[PDB]
Amino acid sequence: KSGTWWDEHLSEENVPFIKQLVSDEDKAQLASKLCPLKDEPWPIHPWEPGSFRVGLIALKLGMMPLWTKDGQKHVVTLLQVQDCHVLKYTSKENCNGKMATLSVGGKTVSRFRKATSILEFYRELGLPPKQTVKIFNITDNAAIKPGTPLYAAHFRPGQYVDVTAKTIGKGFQGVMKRWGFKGQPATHGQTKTHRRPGAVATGDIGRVWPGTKMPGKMGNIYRTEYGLKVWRINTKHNIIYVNGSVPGHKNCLVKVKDSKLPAYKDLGKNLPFPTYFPDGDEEELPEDLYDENVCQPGAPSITFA
Amino acid sequence: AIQKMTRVRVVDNSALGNSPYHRAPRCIHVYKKNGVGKVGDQILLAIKGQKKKALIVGHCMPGPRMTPRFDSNNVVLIEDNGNPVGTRIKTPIPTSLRKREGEYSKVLAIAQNFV
Amino acid sequence: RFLSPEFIPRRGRTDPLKFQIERKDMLERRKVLHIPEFYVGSILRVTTADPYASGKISQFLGICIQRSGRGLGATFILRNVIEGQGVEICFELYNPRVQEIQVVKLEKRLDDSLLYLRDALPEYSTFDVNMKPVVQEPNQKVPVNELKVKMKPKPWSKRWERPNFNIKGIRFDLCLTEQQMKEAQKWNQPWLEFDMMREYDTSKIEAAIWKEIEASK
Amino acid sequence: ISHGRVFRRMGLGPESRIHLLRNLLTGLVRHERIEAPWARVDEMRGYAEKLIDYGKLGDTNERAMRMADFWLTEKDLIPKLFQVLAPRYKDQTGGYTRMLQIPNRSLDRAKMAVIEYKGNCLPPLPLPRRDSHLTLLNQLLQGLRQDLRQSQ
Amino acid sequence: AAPKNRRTIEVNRCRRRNPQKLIKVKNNIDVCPECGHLKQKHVLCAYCYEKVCKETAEIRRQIGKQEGGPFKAPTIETVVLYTGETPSEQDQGKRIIERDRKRPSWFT
RNA sequence: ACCUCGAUGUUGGAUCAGGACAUCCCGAUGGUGCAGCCGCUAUUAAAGGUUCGUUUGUUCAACGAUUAAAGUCCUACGUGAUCUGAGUUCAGACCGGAGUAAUCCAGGUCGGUUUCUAUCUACUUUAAUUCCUCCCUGUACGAAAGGACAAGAGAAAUAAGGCCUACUUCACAAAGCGCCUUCCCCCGUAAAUGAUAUCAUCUCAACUUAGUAUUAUACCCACACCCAAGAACAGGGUU
RNA sequence: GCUACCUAAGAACAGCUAAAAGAGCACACCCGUCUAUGUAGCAAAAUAGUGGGAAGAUUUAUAGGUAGAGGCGACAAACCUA
Ligand SMILES: [Mg+2]
Ligand SMILES: [Mg+2]
Ligand SMILES: [Mg+2]
Ligand SMILES: [Mg+2]
Ligand SMILES: [Mg+2]
Ligand SMILES: [Mg+2]
Ligand SMILES: [Mg+2]
Ligand SMILES: [Mg+2]
Ligand SMILES: [Mg+2]
Ligand SMILES: [Mg+2]
Ligand SMILES: [Mg+2]
Ligand SMILES: [Mg+2]
Ligand SMILES: [Mg+2]
Ligand SMILES: [Mg+2]
Ligand SMILES: [Mg+2]
Ligand SMILES: [Mg+2]
Ligand SMILES: [Mg+2]
Ligand SMILES: [Mg+2]
Ligand SMILES: [Mg+2]
Ligand SMILES: [Mg+2]
Ligand SMILES: [Mg+2]
Ligand SMILES: [Mg+2]
Ligand SMILES: [Zn+2]
């Protein structure tokens, strides 16, 4: 009857033991998936035009400057891929959509704070539960076996990407801040009207049109930034340096996928089509991959000859 | 950032800009879609009760890093054709204006010091 | 020992990994270009590459009146009057187009922010462009210049007399009346120096950063 | 919007908040156990820990003496802070205060809490204790632990 | 603005008996093993806390009697000793608060 | 003089604007007394936009500077239970005038109380445009004067949506004055082949193109404490 | 017993500048210019700021007087128990 939590009936001796045991199990499960190509990997088809591969779920670390060889600064955000794994695959027919769907999970969380069904699903999959699961529409060419890990090197410098995230929630905000209404003057007689909305509608209709801009909750909704350049990849820490700003707060989980803009339709020719596989070990990628125009740290000071 | 009604210091050898007058020269119009004038933007000027076109060569508002931030809103008088009214500009002039070489080649040539 | 201000992060919820990465980049750039030790009040000369400047290089000499920012984006602002025109330039330490930063005169002013030099007399911002760099002893505490600048008429960019600014390098006696000083004291907020939950202790952070720097070296 | 704001808005302003916390903390230093509204106790716990640290710093430290003089409105407690509490916690590095919720105030049904300095002479609080190691679940987990240890 | 019509008892009952209005049953109540009175799991037991508070009040009244006036807080640790109890070596050098009753079993 | 005088508050402005197209600008198109540049006129097009100031209560008007343009209207001459009351025939008063006077003048002028705690309805998170610079090019065109398209490259401005690495207000954060991203059509006509009417005819003939929408894709998809989540509730984390 | 005016006999007016002042700055005190709030309000006319006077034609306590076809009025058709 009464609600319970995992620590309610655990003794002083058993609490630390349970913590250590579960953390060890989680890390062991995470390590067990570090060799996907050696565990019955699904067929790896070559890239073809019209193919859409899977994306990642990264974590917004912060922002920093980044200067290009022309002496131009660019604000670049840091997106860290933290325990990103493919979890579920549904085919065209199964999902009934025009494209197949891959579920991708990120930011492993505690098993003690998840629903029983989710725990069962993750136990069957063999991975610890993830904070967020997002669905990526793909072609059947890009299907990946569930449980495979994804890395920041899945993207490459010079690529253009789309990042979706829940915007910073600003709560119930007034009309001036929410919709940028001019408001009323501060002086010259204005009585108790400085930030209120003006006329909300006209007299004739005798109602308020649906969709009228009114005070209400702002933020905390999913928004997408399109066509952000990937300036750099840090393979050691699995970090993507995405041009410009991204929705959401720091340490927020952002869904990252190849840009949908028409200008960038078929630039996935040279990118790892299904996904980057470190287990392949064709050539161990450098610690940092830079776009051609980036002023790499450790490089000579740029002189405009 | 020079807007309308801004009192602006005419840094130029021009007698029109240097002559005393009971009113300080004020920006009348900023030749830009938004009424905010940064370095290199043209403006109108009610100077000595006369409408004269001038060029912004420095302002108090901070700009992008690595660019000077002058203590006074400096402006150079220019003719409609673009030729500078004066013959010498003593104060430092931001080097970014040389990006507009050709557009203000004569003004840049008149300029003495750059910062 | 001197740890550059940019390395010490402002407190927040951002993950330490971001700071580690940014510090790695900063240390790589410091290996490339030597960023000297300097304080707000020291005279610096920055030689920077500029596409439009004659000779493609530009040297600016001025007094550092404010160091701000943290990480790779840290900046310092140099001020100086040039043919009687006060110019301030906000240089970025890790901008790849700064050829050299030379501490012409290493000194520390009474205040950590000399933004009031704008309202001070021009003589306190004037510095010879071609002044030779004074040499400081290898092992010697950085000199503290106790110069108190005289101000110009009361209309100022900011209310420097207000306690919140906590300015010590202004001769307020020669500028403001006792009545004005008493009126300004209404914003004292004495509790602000004693409320212990606002102080930001950075001993452990500085120790870790120093360990990172030593490892990089 | 109050993202990242860590200080509650209490009293008639910032100064009044500081003074309320100061009175509560002076009472805490004097009596070693104070019951007060939950939010105020939560706000004052950090300041209590900070005073313990300042007392650890020592009598001779002028900064610590000034902090104690400000925060302890009753000057007889400064010798206490420097000679009874700090020596008591010299071994410890933190967690000098124990805060526990109390049944709501009878008057206005306010969320109340009791905050005490650990190791005080006063009678111990009815601290919440975890389930005994001899329970069914705990014994099963002990069996798990023993099996794992035997395996390794 | 004033009501345009009286709201009926049906509408009023809907509003004031909507489960959002109704009091929520609390399932965090539990029996205190010490005294057996009811307590919320996170909250301290009222009965036990009152016991401790009354004993603390007695001890504090003795402390005040020994101090004899304001601003006379001791500069040494304090130990509470009950009838039939003598100071230990640790208790030596500590202010002794004597209580005229047997030591409570819960107190140690 | 049909509802409203046991009250439907009524000029101008602020705020927010919904709608029409009889289109001011941007799009396409026919004609021209269309050489080019400007234009004029007509068809189609309401997705988007349609400036800031001086005097004046002005809506407007004039003027100044711009703009691609600074559209005409309807919405209780939209919107005072959102705001302002400068004008405006309430109470005071002066001037000119009328009257014997009280007092008055669609004359001027100085002043003059802007209520409402929301019961109901309704509503409260639903692929962007434009300008300019260079070049084309001093080319096409033109006697000269002058002076283009299209294509290409680059820059911006605004609008929408986000963000805090810098700068700035400022400081565990919120902001802009800062930065970042912004992606498809629309139809008027111009033509092929071809009958009725063996020519011809772009076709409310069958038909072939410019001619595309059926938008496409994108997004979302499972006790207790703290929180970048939040009025409450809800939501995220607690390994 | 408010208010208009008056009668009797009282009281108050810091400080500074000036000098025997219906003088100036400025408290107390009197008033109520302008703004905001309030508008079933704290108030059936208030609050906060701001402001005019503040040794006088001032303010003000006490008692008395003028009564409605009237009184009183530095005329605002003012005031004469909201
Ligand atoms: Mg405003
Ligand atoms: Mg009002
Ligand atoms: Mg107001
Ligand atoms: Mg004139
Ligand atoms: Mg200023
Ligand atoms: Mg309060
Ligand atoms: Mg009728
Ligand atoms: Mg009739
Ligand atoms: Mg009626
Ligand atoms: Mg039409
Ligand atoms: Mg009409
Ligand atoms: Mg009026
Ligand atoms: Mg008359
Ligand atoms: Mg009037
Ligand atoms: Mg008036
Ligand atoms: Mg109103
Ligand atoms: Mg309302
Ligand atoms: Mg034929
Ligand atoms: Mg006097
Ligand atoms: Mg007088
Ligand atoms: Mg009269
Ligand atoms: Mg009259
Ligand atoms: Zn109990």
Of E40, E73, E106, the CB nearest to D76: E73
Q: Would you say the C-beta of A192 is within 7 Å of strand G?
A: yes
Closest CA to E90 of E82, E100, E78, E99: E78
CA to C1' distance (Å), from B17 to F64: 21
CA distance D70 to C170: 29
Where is B43: in which H helix or E strand? strand B42-47
C28 CB-near residues (< 8 Å, 6+ apart): A297, A298
CA to C1' distance (Å), from A221 to F192:
55
CA A51 from chain center: how many Å? 21
- Is the Cβ–Cβ distance between C187 and C163 less than 8 Å? yes
Residue C42 per-residue DSSP state: B
- H or E element, residue E54: helix E46-67
Q: C125 — phi, psi (to 5°)?
A: -110, -10
Cβ atoms of A163 and A78 within 8 Å: the answer is: no
List of chain D residues whose C-beta atoms are within 8 Å of the C-beta of residue E60: 31, 122
Burial of A301 (0-12, 13-18, 19+ CB in 10 A): middle
The nucleotides of chain G lying under 7 Å from a protein CB are: 35-39
CA of D99 to C1' of F200 (A): 104
Q: CA–C1' distance A188–F96 (Å)? A: 36
Q: Tell me, rounded to whole angstroms, the distance of Cα C69 from its chain centroid.
A: 10
Residues in Cβ contact with B76 at an 8 Å cutoff, skipping those fewer than 6 apart: B10, B11, B12, B54, B55, B57, B84, B86, B89, B107, B110
* Residue D121, Cβ density class (10 Å: 0-12 exposed, 13-18 middle, ≥19 buried): middle
CB A77 within 8 A of CB A245: yes
In angstroms, the CA B84 to CA B109 distance is 10
The whole-angstrom separation of Cα D16 and Cα C190 is: 12
DSSP per residue, B11-39: -SS-HHHHS--SS--EEEEESSSSS-B-T
Strands C85-92 and C57-68: unpaired
3-state SS of chain A? CCCCCCCCCCCCCHHHHHHHHHHHHHHHHHHHCCCCCCCCCCCCCCCCCCCCCCCEEEEEEEEEEEEECCCEEEEEEEEEECCEEEEEEECHHHHCCCCEEEEEEEEECCHHHCCHHHHHHHHHHCCCCEEEEEEEEECHHHCCCCCCEECHHHCCCCCEEEEEEECCCCEEECHHHHHCCCCCCCCCCCCCCCCCCCCCCCCCCCCCCCCCCCCEEECCCEEEEEEEEEEEEECCCCEEEEEECCCCCCCCEEEEEECCCHHHCCCCCCCCCCCCCHHHCCCCCCCEEECCCECCCCCCCCCCC
- Residue A213 (CA) to nucleotide G46 (C1'), in angstroms, measures 39
The Cα of B2 is separated from the nearest Cα of chain C by a number of Å equal to: 17
Give the residue extent of every domain in chain D: 10-120
Tokens 């920041």 — which residue?
Answer: A152
Q: Which CATH superfamily is domain D10-120 in?
A: Ribosomal protein L17 (3.90.1030.10)
Separation CA D117–CA D115 (nearest Å):
7
Nearest 5°: the CA angle C184, C187, C188 is 100
Task: Tell me how many domains chain B contains.
Answer: 1
Q: Which of residues 64-93 of B touch C (CB under 8 A)?
A: 65-72, 74, 90-92
Secondary structure in 3-state letters for C154-199? CCCCCCCCCHHHCCCCECHHHCCCHHHHHHHHHHCCHHHHCCCCCC
Query: Which residue from C123, C106, C107, C114 is spatially nearest to C65, judged by alpha carbons?
Result: C114
User: Do C87 and B68 lie within an 8 Å CB cutoff?
Assistant: yes
* C-alpha to C-alpha distance for E11 and E54, rounded to whole angstroms: 51
- Whole-angstrom Cα distance, residue E26 to residue E19? 15
| Nearest amino-acid residue to F217, taking CA and C1' | A260
Listed in sequence order, the DSSP H helices in chain B are: 15-18, 105-110
Distance in Å, alpha carbon of A181 to nearest chain C alpha carbon: 30
CA-CA distance, A164 to A240, in Å (whole number)? 15
Taking the centre of ligand 19 as the mean of its atom positions, its distance from the CA of residue C178, in whole angstroms, is 28
Nearest nucleotide relative to E28: CA against C1': F223
Which of the 8 DSSP states describes residue C151? B
Residue A80 pairs in a beta bridge with A59, A239
Give the nearest nucleotide to A190, CA to C1': F83
B114: how many CB neighbours lie within 10 A of its CB?
Answer: 19
**Is C210 in a helix, a strand, or coil?**
helix
Specify burial of residue C86 (Cβ count, 10 A radius: 0-12, 13-18, 19+): buried
Q: Decide if B15 contacts B30 (C-beta within 8 A).
A: no
Angle ∠(A234,A239,A243) on CA atoms, nearest 5: 100
The answer, yes or no, to whether E and A have at least 3 beta-carbon pairs within 8 Å is: yes
Signed CA dihedral, A258, A259, A262, A268: sign only: negative
Among A107, A102, A77, residue whose Cα is nearest residue A225: A77
Among C91, C98, B95, C54, residue whose Cα is nearest residue A303:
C98
Strand partners, A137: A101
3-state DSSP call for residue B89? Answer: strand
Chain A 101-160 residues whose Cβ is under 7 Å from strand F: 105, 109-113, 115, 117-118, 121-122, 128-137
Give the contacts of C113 (CB within 8 A, at least 6 positions apart): C40, C65, C66
Ligand 9 centre from E2 Cα, in Å?
14
Contacts 24+ apart (CB under 8 A), A116-122: A121/A87
Through-space separation of residue C153 CA and nucleotide F135 C1' in angstroms: 55
Quick one: which of A295, A74, A234, A228 has its CA closest to C21?
Answer: A234
Q: Which residues does B38 contact at the CB level (< 8 Å), separation at least 6? A: B1, B2, B56, B59, B61, B63
Q: Which positions of E make up the binding site?
A: 32, 35, 45, 48
Is strand F in 7 Å reach of the CB of A208? yes
Give yes or no for CB of B99 within 7 Å of strand F.
Answer: no
Count of domains observed in chain E: 1
List residues forming the annotated binding site of E for Zn(2+): 32, 35, 45, 48
Query: Pseudo-torsion of CA E9, E12, E18, E23, nearest 10°?
Result: -100
- CB neighbour burial string for C31-68, b if at least 16 within 10 angstroms, e if fewer: ebbebeebbbbbbbbbebbbebbeeeebebbbbbbbbe
Closest nt by CA–C1' to B80: F65
Judging contacts by C-beta atoms under 8 Å, the chain A residues touching residue D149 are: none
Here the tokens at position B22 are 């009971």
Distance CA(E54)–CA(D30), nearest Å, equals 18
Question: Could you tell me which of E107, C197, E48, E105 has the C-alpha nearest to residue D100?
Answer: E48
Query: Has residue E11 been placed in a domain?
Result: no
Q: What is the experimental method? A: cryo-EM
Are A84 and A34 contacting, i.e. CB atoms less than 8 angstroms apart?
no
Residue found under tokens 């001070």: C120
- A188 Cα: distance to centroid of ligand 12 (angstroms): 14
CA distance readout (Å), D131 to A8, A15, C211, E42: 8, 11, 44, 14
Nearest to B29 by CA among B1, B4, B58, B52: B4
Q: Is the CB of A117 under 7 A from strand G?
A: no
| Resolution value in angstroms | 2.6
Range list of β-strands (E), chain C: 43-49, 57-68, 75-82, 85-92, 98-105, 108-109, 144-145
- Cα–Cα dist A174/A198, whole Å: 12
Name the residue of chain A whose CA is nearest to D1's CA. A170
From the alpha carbon of A191, which nucleotide's C1' atom is closest? F83
Which DSSP string corresponds to chain D?
--TT--S---TTSHHHHHHHHHHHHHHHHHHSEEEEEHHHHHHHHHHHHHHHHHHHH-SS-HHHHHHHHHH-SSTTHHHHIIIIIHHHHSS--S--EEEEEESPPTTT---EEEEEETT-SSPPP----PPPTTSHHHHHHHHHHHHHHHH-
CB contact set of A110 (below 8 Å; sequence gap of 6+): A129
AA letter at D21: L
Q: Check C33 against A301: CB less than 8 A apart.
A: yes
Contacts of C71 in chain A (CB under 8 A): 64
Q: How far is the CA of D45 from the centre of ligand 18 (A)?
A: 102
In 3D space, the residue among D50, C90, C107 whose CA is nearest the CA of residue B64 turns out to be C90
Find all residues with CB under 8 Å of D137, minimum gap 6, and list them.
Answer: A9, A10, D131
Distance of CA B15 to the CA centre of its chain: 15
Residue A279 has which token pair? 């287990």
Phi, psi of A125 (to 5 degrees): -70, -30
- Tokens (6 digits) for E23: 């009091």
- CB burial class (10 A; 0-12, 13-18, 19+) of residue E69? exposed
> Could you say which residues from 156 to 185 on chain A have a Cβ atom under 8 Å away from some Cβ of chain D?
168, 170-171, 173
Question: Could you count the other beta carbons within 10 Å of the beta carbon of residue D11?
Answer: 14
Residues 6+ apart with CB under 8 A from A56: A81, A84, A104, A106, A150, A152, A154, A155, A255, A256, A257
| Residues of chain E with C-beta less than 8 angstroms from the C-beta of A3 | 27-28
User: Of C12, C29, C56, which is closest to A297 when you measure between CB atoms?
Assistant: C29
Among A40, A87, A75, A79, CA closest to A57: A79
Closest CA to A76 of A287, A241, A188, A263: A241
> Are residues A237 and C17, on separate chains, in Cβ contact within 8 Å?
yes
H or E element in which residue B70 lies: strand B68-70
Report in angstroms the alpha-carbon separations of D110 from A22, B19, D37, D40, D44: 39, 75, 7, 11, 17
Give the rounded distance of the alpha carbon of D12 from its chain centre. 24
As a dihedral over the C-alpha atoms of residue C150, residue C153, residue C154, residue C156, rounded to 10 degrees, the angle is -80
Instruction: List CB contacts (< 8 A) between A78 and chain C.
Output: 18, 21
Contact D58, D80 (CB under 8 A): no
Q: How far is the CA of A39 from the centre of ligand 13 (A)?
A: 111
Tokens 């001025």 — which residue? C62
D62-71 and D14-31 helices, crossing angle to 10°:
100
Closest of C126, C124, C174, C169 to residue C148, by C-alpha: C169
Which 3 state secondary structure label does DSSP give C124? helix
Report the C-alpha gap between D62 and D68 in whole angstroms. Answer: 10
Angle formed at CA B42 by CA B39 and CA B48, multiple of 5 degrees: 115
B113 membership: H or E segment, kind and range: strand B111-114
What is the domain extent for residue B65? 1-115
Query: For residue E89, what are the domain limits?
Result: 27-108
Surface of A (75-104) touching C: CB under 8 A: 78, 80
- Cβ of residue A170 lies below 7 Å from strand F: yes
Residue-number span of the structural domain to which C118 is assigned: 1-217
- Count the domains in chain C: 1
Paired with B10 in beta bridges are: B75
Q: Measured CA to C1', what is the nucleotide nearest A112? A: F239
The C75-82 sheet, strands edge to edge? B68-70, C85-92, C75-82, C57-68, C43-49, C98-105
- Cβ-defined contact of C197 to D54 (cutoff 8 Å): no
**What distance in Å separates residue E107's CA from the closest CA in chain D?**
6
The answer for residues whose C-beta is within 8 angstroms of residue D51's C-beta and 6 or more apart is C196, D25, D29, D67, D68, D71, D72, D81
Residues 6+ apart with CB under 8 A from A148: A33, A36, A41, A85, A86, A275
Of C83, C85, C91, the CB nearest to B72: C85
Distance from C-alpha of B53 to C-alpha of B41, rounded to nearest angstrom: 11
